[PDB]
Design a protein around this motif. Structure first.
Motif, PDB file in Angstrom:
ATOM      1  N   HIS A  98     -64.855  60.190  95.822  1.00 53.50           N
ATOM      2  CA  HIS A  98     -65.160  60.350  94.415  1.00 53.50           C
ATOM      3  C   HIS A  98     -64.727  59.072  93.715  1.00 53.50           C
ATOM      4  O   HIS A  98     -63.542  58.794  93.565  1.00 53.50           O
ATOM      5  CB  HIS A  98     -64.423  61.541  93.817  1.00 53.50           C
ATOM      6  CG  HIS A  98     -64.727  62.825  94.448  1.00 53.50           C
ATOM      7  ND1 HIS A  98     -65.952  63.468  94.303  1.00 53.50           N
ATOM      8  CD2 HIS A  98     -63.991  63.688  95.173  1.00 53.50           C
ATOM      9  CE1 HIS A  98     -65.957  64.635  94.900  1.00 53.50           C
ATOM     10  NE2 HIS A  98     -64.773  64.797  95.465  1.00 53.50           N
ATOM     11  N   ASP A  99     -65.713  58.271  93.309  1.00 50.41           N
ATOM     12  CA  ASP A  99     -65.476  56.981  92.697  1.00 50.41           C
ATOM     13  C   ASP A  99     -65.117  57.151  91.231  1.00 50.41           C
ATOM     14  O   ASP A  99     -65.974  57.479  90.406  1.00 50.41           O
ATOM     15  CB  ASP A  99     -66.743  56.115  92.819  1.00 50.41           C
ATOM     16  CG  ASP A  99     -66.585  54.719  92.258  1.00 50.41           C
ATOM     17  OD1 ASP A  99     -65.419  54.295  92.086  1.00 50.41           O
ATOM     18  OD2 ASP A  99     -67.638  54.072  92.008  1.00 50.41           O
ATOM     19  N   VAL A 100     -63.864  56.898  90.870  1.00 48.82           N
ATOM     20  CA  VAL A 100     -63.459  56.994  89.468  1.00 48.82           C
ATOM     21  C   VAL A 100     -64.031  55.816  88.723  1.00 48.82           C
ATOM     22  O   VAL A 100     -63.922  54.657  89.190  1.00 48.82           O
ATOM     23  CB  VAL A 100     -61.925  57.042  89.365  1.00 48.82           C
ATOM     24  CG1 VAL A 100     -61.501  57.050  87.918  1.00 48.82           C
ATOM     25  CG2 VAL A 100     -61.387  58.258  90.133  1.00 48.82           C
ATOM     26  N   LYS A 101     -64.636  56.050  87.560  1.00 46.58           N
ATOM     27  CA  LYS A 101     -65.319  55.041  86.781  1.00 46.58           C
ATOM     28  C   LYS A 101     -64.814  54.847  85.374  1.00 46.58           C
ATOM     29  O   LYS A 101     -65.089  53.827  84.766  1.00 46.58           O
ATOM     30  CB  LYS A 101     -66.834  55.256  86.762  1.00 46.58           C
ATOM     31  CG  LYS A 101     -67.462  55.139  88.186  1.00 46.58           C
ATOM     32  CD  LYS A 101     -68.974  55.307  88.111  1.00 46.58           C
ATOM     33  CE  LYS A 101     -69.653  55.153  89.415  1.00 46.58           C
ATOM     34  NZ  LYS A 101     -71.150  55.236  89.239  1.00 46.58           N
ATOM     35  N   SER A 102     -64.092  55.846  84.792  1.00 50.13           N
ATOM     36  CA  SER A 102     -63.719  55.827  83.404  1.00 50.13           C
ATOM     37  C   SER A 102     -62.190  55.810  83.231  1.00 50.13           C
ATOM     38  O   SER A 102     -61.506  56.642  83.848  1.00 50.13           O
ATOM     39  CB  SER A 102     -64.242  57.094  82.724  1.00 50.13           C
ATOM     40  OG  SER A 102     -63.798  57.253  81.388  1.00 50.13           O
ATOM     41  N   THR A 128     -57.300  52.894  90.310  1.00 56.73           N
ATOM     42  CA  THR A 128     -57.503  54.004  91.223  1.00 56.73           C
ATOM     43  C   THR A 128     -57.904  53.622  92.626  1.00 56.73           C
ATOM     44  O   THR A 128     -58.066  54.511  93.487  1.00 56.73           O
ATOM     45  CB  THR A 128     -58.518  55.048  90.672  1.00 56.73           C
ATOM     46  OG1 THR A 128     -59.825  54.473  90.517  1.00 56.73           O
ATOM     47  CG2 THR A 128     -58.034  55.643  89.379  1.00 56.73           C
ATOM     48  N   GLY A 129     -58.059  52.338  92.941  1.00 55.59           N
ATOM     49  CA  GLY A 129     -58.504  51.940  94.258  1.00 55.59           C
ATOM     50  C   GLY A 129     -59.881  52.489  94.520  1.00 55.59           C
ATOM     51  O   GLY A 129     -60.775  52.411  93.671  1.00 55.59           O
ATOM     52  N   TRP A 130     -60.108  53.083  95.705  1.00 52.39           N
ATOM     53  CA  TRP A 130     -61.395  53.653  96.037  1.00 52.39           C
ATOM     54  C   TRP A 130     -61.668  54.999  95.363  1.00 52.39           C
ATOM     55  O   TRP A 130     -62.778  55.512  95.507  1.00 52.39           O
ATOM     56  CB  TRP A 130     -61.523  53.824  97.556  1.00 52.39           C
ATOM     57  CG  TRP A 130     -61.607  52.537  98.298  1.00 52.39           C
ATOM     58  CD1 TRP A 130     -60.673  52.048  99.186  1.00 52.39           C
ATOM     59  CD2 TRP A 130     -62.674  51.588  98.274  1.00 52.39           C
ATOM     60  NE1 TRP A 130     -61.103  50.851  99.702  1.00 52.39           N
ATOM     61  CE2 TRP A 130     -62.333  50.549  99.157  1.00 52.39           C
ATOM     62  CE3 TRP A 130     -63.918  51.525  97.586  1.00 52.39           C
ATOM     63  CZ2 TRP A 130     -63.170  49.434  99.362  1.00 52.39           C
ATOM     64  CZ3 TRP A 130     -64.724  50.439  97.788  1.00 52.39           C
ATOM     65  CH2 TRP A 130     -64.355  49.407  98.670  1.00 52.39           C
ATOM     66  N   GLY A 188     -63.952  51.167  87.278  1.00 54.20           N
ATOM     67  CA  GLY A 188     -65.328  50.744  87.324  1.00 54.20           C
ATOM     68  C   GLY A 188     -65.971  51.153  88.629  1.00 54.20           C
ATOM     69  O   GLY A 188     -65.393  51.907  89.423  1.00 54.20           O
ATOM     70  N   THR A 189     -67.183  50.679  88.862  1.00 56.82           N
ATOM     71  CA  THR A 189     -67.889  51.026  90.077  1.00 56.82           C
ATOM     72  C   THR A 189     -67.138  50.486  91.284  1.00 56.82           C
ATOM     73  O   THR A 189     -66.738  49.321  91.326  1.00 56.82           O
ATOM     74  CB  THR A 189     -69.298  50.375  90.021  1.00 56.82           C
ATOM     75  OG1 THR A 189     -69.955  50.984  88.877  1.00 56.82           O
ATOM     76  CG2 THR A 189     -70.085  50.623  91.308  1.00 56.82           C
ATOM     77  N   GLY A 190     -66.969  51.341  92.302  1.00 63.40           N
ATOM     78  CA  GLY A 190     -66.269  50.929  93.500  1.00 63.40           C
ATOM     79  C   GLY A 190     -64.766  50.770  93.309  1.00 63.40           C
ATOM     80  O   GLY A 190     -64.149  51.443  92.461  1.00 63.40           O
ATOM     81  N   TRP A 191     -64.156  49.934  94.128  1.00 65.07           N
ATOM     82  CA  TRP A 191     -62.714  49.771  94.093  1.00 65.07           C
ATOM     83  C   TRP A 191     -62.306  49.214  92.743  1.00 65.07           C
ATOM     84  O   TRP A 191     -62.926  48.246  92.261  1.00 65.07           O
ATOM     85  CB  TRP A 191     -62.282  48.818  95.250  1.00 65.07           C
ATOM     86  CG  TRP A 191     -60.791  48.827  95.460  1.00 65.07           C
ATOM     87  CD1 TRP A 191     -60.105  49.522  96.429  1.00 65.07           C
ATOM     88  CD2 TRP A 191     -59.776  48.123  94.712  1.00 65.07           C
ATOM     89  NE1 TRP A 191     -58.772  49.303  96.311  1.00 65.07           N
ATOM     90  CE2 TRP A 191     -58.534  48.458  95.261  1.00 65.07           C
ATOM     91  CE3 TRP A 191     -59.816  47.239  93.612  1.00 65.07           C
ATOM     92  CZ2 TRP A 191     -57.340  47.973  94.730  1.00 65.07           C
ATOM     93  CZ3 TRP A 191     -58.629  46.760  93.103  1.00 65.07           C
ATOM     94  CH2 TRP A 191     -57.406  47.141  93.671  1.00 65.07           C
TER      95      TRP A 191
HETATM   96 CA    CA Z   1     -63.921  53.049  90.827  1.00 64.20          CA
END
Ligand code: CA
Length: 369
Positions: free
Chosen positions: A326-330, A350-352, A343-346
């Protein structure tokens, strides 16, 4: 989307898609503590009994001098409670054994804690070890603690043990009196900044009305009444070089980047934990790390405890296979417009992101780890 609320530890398998995996019944798990765990063991019995679970086999280990001080630290019990109950819940209600590696409180400086790490590595009986502890890495470096402990973690990784360490609860402001806002001045926590451990950051977890996973944002609950920030630690070490497996995160310095992965940490979305007999809703990256430990121990049990130190595999697998997380973005891990952004990806908060355990298990079955 979703709702912010507290969660029983037995919910973490459903939240992180681990229900279909074996429990950790075939894996021994360690917890590093400062001082004793006598109340913690009573709270653990309350936990297993209330949840109708089979009892957990425990051992306590005096890791230093036999003349040392292993009395209970009263506040500390809440940490060891969080750690043990969150591990057992995330593990699906069973672990082979839970070992409490207790640091001597009357040892000089950080030597008691160092000796607790050393004992867990020397014994080499726990496959996965939780460390819900941290402090400014520059302080650890100045007094030689960093170097002494990194040698121990290096041995752990080489022997196939996974140490999991909370990334920090101060956001980017670890070294500024443990979390006071400091503008553009960013720092990180030890031992999370070691390349020989898995560093685990923190999310705000939203669930659906049926209790399923909805979404995760960065953990950042702003300032307490003292003015201290409560947010996920993340950034890069000023000392540790980048391990080669982190090269997949382009555009970052030649340093150990952290965290590696993240799980629930917001107090507002945290775990309901028995502490001196009373339920409290508790968060932090002190929660996220034991979630990882219990989930990872399930995967160890599914793989005959044969999975080595997983950092390189996480970076290669997740960068190539976004469905594993689950890619955290916000969100952000600072204050006042400062800090790092998800943001998108690492990303640095939050890392990955968080692991989808059944998807990771299928990947391991196909590809190894
Ligand atoms: Ca992310």
């Amino acid at each position: 989307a979703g709702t912010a609320k507290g969660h029983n530890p037995t919910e973490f398998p459903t939240i992180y898609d681990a229900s279909s995996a074996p429990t950790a019944a075939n894996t021994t798990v360690g917890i590093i503590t400062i001082g004793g765990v006598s109340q913690t063991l009573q709270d653990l019995q309350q936990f297993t009994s209330a949840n109708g679970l089979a009892s957990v086999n425990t051992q306590t280990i005096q890791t230093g001098s036999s003349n040392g001080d292993y009395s209970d630290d009263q506040q500390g019990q809440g940490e060891w409670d969080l750690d043990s109950q969150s591990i057992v819940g995330s593990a699906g209600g069973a672990v082979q054994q839970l070992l409490f590696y207790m640091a001597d409180q009357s040892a000089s400086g950080n030597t008691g804690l160092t000796q607790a790490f050393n004992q867990a590595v020397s014994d080499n009986v726990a496959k996965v070890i939780n460390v819900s502890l941290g402090w400014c890495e520059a302080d650890a470096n100045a007094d030689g603690t960093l170097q002494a402990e990194d040698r121990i973690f290096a041995t752990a990784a080489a022997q196939g043990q996974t140490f999991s360490v909370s990334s920090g609860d101060e956001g980017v402001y670890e070294c500024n009196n443990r979390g006071y806002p400091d503008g553009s001045t960013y720092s990180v926590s030890w031992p999370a900044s070691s390349p020989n451990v898995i560093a685990v950051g923190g999310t705000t977890l939203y669930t659906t009305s049926a209790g399923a996973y909805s979404n995760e944002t960065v953990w950042n609950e702003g300032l307490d009444s003292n003015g201290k920030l409560w947010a996920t630690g993340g950034g890069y070490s000023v000392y540790e070089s980048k391990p080669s497996w982190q090269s997949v995160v382009s555009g970052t310095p030649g340093r150990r980047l952290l965290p590696d992965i993240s799980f629930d940490a917001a107090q507002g979305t945290g775990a309901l934990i028995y502490n001196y007999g009373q339920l409290q809703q508790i968060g932090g990256t002190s929660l996220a790390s034991p979630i990882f430990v219990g989930l990872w121990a399930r995967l160890q049990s599914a793989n005959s405890n044969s999975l080595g130190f997983p950092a390189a595999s996480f970076y290669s697998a997740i960068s190539s296979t976004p469905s594993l997380v689950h890619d955290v973005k916000s969100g952000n891990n600072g204050y006042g417009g400062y800090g790092y952004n998800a943001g998108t990806g690492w990303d640095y908060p939050t890392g990955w992101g968080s692991l989808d355990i059944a998807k990771l298990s299928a990947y391991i079955r196909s590809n190894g780890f």
